[PDB]
Design a binder for this molecule. Structure first.
Ligand SMILES: CC(C)(COP(=O)(O)OP(=O)(O)OC[C@H]1O[C@@H](n2cnc3c(N)ncnc32)[C@H](O)[C@@H]1OP(=O)(O)O)[C@@H](O)C(=O)NCCC(=O)NCCSC=O
Ligand SMILES: Cc1ncc(C[n+]2csc(CCOP(=O)(O)OP(=O)(O)O)c2C)c(N)n1
Ligand SMILES: [Mg+2]
Ligand SMILES: [Mg+2]
Ligand SMILES: [Mg+2]
Ligand SMILES: [Mg+2]
Lengths: 584, 584, 580
């Protein structure tokens, strides 16, 4: 079978055999040899307006599908344009491969065109960042890097490979073209230890108010084993931004409008593929004052951070959840606490959803962003099925409203733990190309949207059927609010009444502007029918979000949010005794 | 005088006392304490749509004015959005300070909001990248970093400082607030050694065809000492993209249409504040086959790279040029070679300029980009003075045409050695705010423009009177050309017939589209009268630039350009003798 | 229960509660606050002559006992003196903690005493390297770092923590002193997936010549599940330098003197906690021309390097071995290939061992190093049980002789994949302190010994009952031999006839010089009886070692060894010319 082929040809074959049917990127001569070979093999090339956007598209693809995705960018500014999107994928622990161009070996350190230390810049935010200088070993390096992206020898996240242009053009002998490096590999499935499963089952039997909080790792499962454990355990259930859609909304455990009540009173916190980072108050006793802790994950990045488990299970989370459910066969949980939370949640969530359809305009006479979520809700079952829809959110206040306003989605993506503004359009494109028969709706602040707005062109040229709804409040409004509240002086946080519909139409998309909230349902209906489309909603600056009211803009010393920080300050003063003296 | 003040207040005072009258950035809570204190001191805040753009604006400010400029960006994605612009400033050796936000010390390594290893990511492309954790020493650190940006303990370029939000809020005692750290410092002026000056004078006296090539370091002078040395030496003169405007166009040495002829035949190459990087063929004997080498600079980054000088002068370049001119008092140079180049240059450059006014449309029936440079030339002395105009160029083919088409500018900026697409709009903004009574004209490819187009909003909101002229050829055209030529398959390099005038109007700027080259002068006149303005020129894909024809897209093994690479391959085969054997 | 205590006190308590009963180090003011608190808690301080030797001692302790060991060293040169020993532990994937001193936060970047970028220097060779600037979070950082040393979020290896002296003096409130961070944690035990177990059992049933090669991860087990799989599978068995002692020498699978024959013919290579690095020919098809590959390990650092498995099991290796053994309950392996290798191994190994007793002196009239191994063999079952002895080897030719000359040992340590000369004495000290009732015998080249010789003092002052036997050949001899062979010019590889016995005596150890090989048994008997003790053996420069003439000094393009490299050159020629 095998004959001598150039490195660039073997790279393209590696990718295709690993299940890569599309590559996101932006062409330059340093990667053209691979670009050409991917084209020749029938791999779709999704070319973008800013390399960072290509990496965001890969991120969305992998997060949605489970298939490791690929971005390809040229030397120098091509690679440096990806740093934010790489960092975002690193924080979220998403497997992806970035292939960068780089100058030929002979010109090393001589000031060749577009030279910059790519591997040194990317090393801190990647699982691997390497320059491949041996033609014979390029295939082996690709396969190992792909494994490291899944989390081998680290934790899941992005990897970076570059091949000097002279090496790309070298031949690889047939003997070195080994099938074991070319072939797709299954995910690892480490299994739980029976004694850890029994120990967790014993903690659940002893707990009165157990609570499961899911993350990334749980979201790699279909949710069915998590529901088996919820049923067997009687635990309350919370998800996070990275783990929406695993548990039906009507499930007796699902209490997503009772987040603070669950954290305050749970006596057994079980994390499932979830970090106890700022989004869960660092798992601090100040935020979980009654909780024993158990941690379940396929990576210690979701076992050891900030709190240790009385039990920690390192295993494929589905298998762990199934085994604990099995161990609770003859347990009859006390669900009084869960059922009381659920009764109040059902009413609070229903009332909140219904109020989205009629929210008053703010004091400036413009639309409250809640009306966008109400109009989507009104259209559900009519012109779209939200239960089949990929929902994306981005921005400041808009994003915080979206976490309450978006309840019925198939899948949800957003700015993530990194707070990465500008993901909305690139994520919408990756999602739409992965799921061409699903509605894809991105709701975004105007600040965030300006970062990646020109990717509306990409959506039109590649026919990604996205709908982008802009909360056009002429501001970085959550920042304007923190300025007013904590300094009395608003400066450098105002934007303008930009025609984002006109920007979309300039790039060949359907555009409409809305000033009257009664026009929103019709404008979003027209956008869904004419995707790719943008709806530019003139929204109020008088709309405090849950995040603006909790001090997210101020950056307290110990926690992201003022109320959590207050509890932390109190915790640090406990029981110091006569040892204490005033800082003077 | 002095009392306890918070770190953030002392930072703002440091900046203002160091001559900072504006800061470019994008607000977040992590830098709000400094942002507020700059506002309170009357420092102008130029807030942008993408943090990378703020660093490009600082770069343009410093390159134009000589005053070290400042960008301020928030933690996480705020800092990671600057990497390309930082890299660009590092390659070009431009002093600038980036102030980044970062999370409070107590949350170190805990997964706080927007955490990422900023200093590790930026260390390879900065002169210093530090986290300031001692309130008492913040002022001292700022002043040392500012010195390192000028090139102390390194070479000129960007520096990065971040202050954890808890440290920003700490008080500094009055004793630690030292005037020697707060005060503006003069540039260093190391002086030449008389013996090196005499040695260079002797080499000039012995040379028949001496040639000066200027760079960055020469461009920090007003050009008058360089002209004294040209007059005294009889040398031919070439500039580079980073050193335009130092020598009158009519000067007997100025032979900018004879670049290859000068490099081929010079017997004495004198670099003045210039790197022998890819833009000058690595100073290779393959490109300068007859040249002895002399190097003059205030930094060894422009003395030791790729070629060593028979003499090297490390000194303030003005002083070096003046001293060598003095040493040649009674020398009568042989200028036959110079004067013969000049006679042919005068005619070639005049004919080329005049032909810009009537260039034929390409085979697709659209405008040749040369017509943009002709229309600017036609308007010169009428509605603008090109000799007072800051010209900016960006893109691929468009940029290569611009290097021949732009001859009469006050100052010129472009994509630089790094090939940093998307600098046009941000640079135009920084230039326009530095020089509010000067025309600022940016000519850009459509590919490059999509990266930073949304900064047209910034130009409108801050009233930066820029004119952006887009070469709208519906392509990354220099890439499309290299694909066709070297692979036969054009893929992923096509864009669309986007309404860039409509994008500008969406953001409140004056916009006009041009399809007929006879309308260009009127459209550019209207743009200059209504700045900020954009002219969207529908240009041809049938237009090979000097760069497309020399293989810049292909990346040869040894040089950026095919003809130079050919010469290099020939050089490597010289005189190997019987030792040689076929690679088989 | 808890009250406010200084950081330094909470660090000492963390270590003791994690099972640390000893800390290896060298005092400086930057670490004195911790040093003092360890002393007060009764944690033994083993103070050394060079910080690198403290980290070698920690490495040996962890590798032998399974308990993560700790070195503590001061700012600046105290930390930079550890880099070789840290790199060695990183290469061998040994958990250990290095606690470094560093200057106070207010003097950051001001040129304080002993300042240097410790965390930047150590980042590339550690699983974590951090400066701890929040007193409240030091205990949490220690516990996370300890987990990472075990391999969480990485792979097993050394970690580095430093606390600025101002932070060491800060108080930690009682609420932040969480028991979950202070307490010792069990090792993780990920379990095999039954489908992978069945797939490996199917490959074993279909193989005619299966072979298991063990490494570090197998050596973390007691070997009983490995023997169960050997018995169930009929596989041949090879160990490596890092995995000796798991399988009795008399076991029908143990064919250590047939390494080449095993690699050449096996049709199923099974790696057990082992890397396919240079020591196994990169697992190359050039070196294993008939082998399908299966990989078993609790870390992907021993699954994905160079060769992929048709099946890869990421699990605690004992559990994986046990499950595959179970799956083969009704399998009757064809062991003819195994039994043929074993018959030739038995004869070859026996003849080799017996010849050690009578190896003639070299052409220069001096002892052949094999006589050292013959004398140890003669003493076995008489003066000591080598099967209860911790054997350590170091050097060039001496080490190569040692790999074949040392066949019985409770445990074996050496220079490792990193080729880290000078480990013998510090390893012997860590081993002797960990196993005070076991004989500890370190055989070293004279070149290697010069690096760490002054740690004989440490052995004497801490009563570490070690025996050091020096192959004193007045040379870096494996290097002198490569120069003679390949350049015809020996330069800068000669040493002198140094009195290493006299060095030992100067540091208060027992010393004896041996020039007559018939005196070796007696001298080694006297050394064992008077440990700590050194035997300085005047050995020949004129003796080829098993490693001689194999291109080790040449450093071929593709493989460590010429014959392997030749096979790689031939592999790259296969099918070239054949395009059409
Ligand atoms: C790369 C290697 C692991 C490869 O060595 P191997 O071929 O695995 O050899 P060894 O295990 O040492 O054994 C070599 C041969 O001896 C045979 N052998 C082994 N034991 C015996 C006994 N008891 N009797 C007879 N023969 C024996 C074995 O079957 C091999 O022959 P065959 O069956 O014919 O193969 C090693 O060479 C090595 O580690 N050296 C590199 C240098 C180094 O790491 N040291 C640091 C200091 S020098 C660095 O600067
Ligand atoms: C620190 C160090 N320096 C150099 C080497 C290279 N090296 C490998 S073996 C060897 C010679 C060892 O000499 P010795 O310990 O006397 O053993 P001999 O070969 O003489 O038996 C050398 C220098 C090394 N591995 N480590
Ligand atoms: Mg960017
Ligand atoms: Mg907004
Ligand atoms: Mg173009
Ligand atoms: Mg020796």
């Amino acid at each position: 079978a095998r004959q001598s082929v150039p490195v660039a040809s073997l790279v393209a074959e590696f990718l295709q055999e690993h299940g890569v049917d599309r590559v996101f990127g932006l062409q330059g001569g340093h990667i053209q040899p691979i670009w050409d070979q991917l084209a020749r093999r029938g791999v779709r090339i999704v070319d973008v307006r800013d390399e960072g956007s290509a990496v965001h598209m890969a991120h969305a693809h992998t997060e949605l599908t489970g298939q490791t995705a690929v971005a390809m960018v040229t030397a120098g500014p091509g690679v440096t344009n990806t740093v934010t999107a790489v960092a975002n994928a690193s924080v979220s622990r998403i497997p992806l491969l970035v292939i960068g161009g780089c100058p030929p070996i002979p010109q090393s350190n001589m000031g060749p065109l577009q030279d910059i230390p790519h591997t040194a810049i990317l090393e801190p935010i990647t699982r691997l960042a390497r320059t491949l200088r041996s033609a014979d070993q390029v295939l082996r390096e690709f396969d190992e890097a792909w494994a490291r992206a899944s989390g081998d020898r680290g934790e899941p996240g992005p990897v970076y490979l570059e091949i000097p242009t002279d090496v790309l053009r070298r031949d690889v002998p047939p003997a070195l073209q080994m099938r074991e490096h070319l072939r797709a590999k299954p995910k690892r499935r480490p299994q739980p230890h029976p004694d850890d499963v029994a120990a967790v089952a014993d903690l659940i039997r002893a707990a009165e108010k157990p609570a499961i909080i899911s993350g990334r790792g749980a979201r790699t499962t279909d949710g069915t084993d998590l529901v088996r454990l919820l049923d067997a355990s009687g635990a309350a259930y919370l998800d996070t931004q990275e783990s929406r859609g695993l548990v039906p909304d009507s499930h007796p455990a699902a209490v997503g409008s009772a987040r603070s009540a669950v954290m305050r009173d749970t006596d057994l916190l079980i994390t499932v593929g979830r970090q106890l980072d700022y989004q869960l108050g660092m798992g601090s006793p100040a935020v979980f004052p009654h909780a024993k802790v158990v941690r379940i994950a396929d990576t210690a990045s979701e076992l050891i951070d900030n709190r240790r488990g009385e039990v920690e299970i390192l295993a494929e989370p589905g298998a762990a959840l199934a085994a604990i459910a099995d161990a609770l066969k003859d347990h009859t949980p006390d669900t009084s606490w869960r059922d009381e939370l659920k009764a109040k949640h059902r009413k609070r969530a229903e009332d909140y959803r219904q109020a989205l359809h009629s929210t008053e305009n703010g004091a400036d006479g413009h639309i409250h962003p809640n009306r966008i979520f109400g109009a989507l809700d009104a259209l559900d079952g009519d012109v779209l099925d939200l239960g089949e829809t990929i929902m994306i959110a981005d921005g400041g206040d808009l994003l915080s409203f979206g976490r309450l306003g978006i309840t019925k989605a198939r899948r949800y993506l957003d700015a993530g733990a990194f707070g990465c503004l500008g993901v909305a359009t690139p994520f919408a494109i990756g999602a739409a190309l992965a799921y061409p028969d699903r509605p894809v709706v991105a709701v975004t602040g105007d600040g965030a949207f300006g970062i990646t707005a020109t990717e509306i062109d990409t959506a039109v040229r590649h026919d990604a059927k996205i709908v982008v709804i802009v909360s056009n409040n002429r501001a970085w409004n959550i920042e304007r609010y923190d300025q007013a509240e904590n300094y009395g002086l608003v400066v450098g946080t105002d934007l303008a009444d930009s025609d984002y519909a006109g920007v979309a139409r300039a790039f060949g998309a359907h555009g409409e502007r809305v000033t009257d909230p009664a026009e929103l349902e019709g404008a979003i209906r027209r956008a869904l029918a004419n995707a790719p489309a943008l709806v530019d909603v003139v929204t109020t600056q008088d709309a405090a979000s849950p995040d603006s009211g909790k001090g997210l803009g101020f950056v307290p010393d110990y926690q992201a949010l003022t109320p959590w920080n207050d509890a932390e300050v109190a915790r640090r003063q406990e029981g110091i005794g006569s040892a204490w003296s005033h800082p003077q």
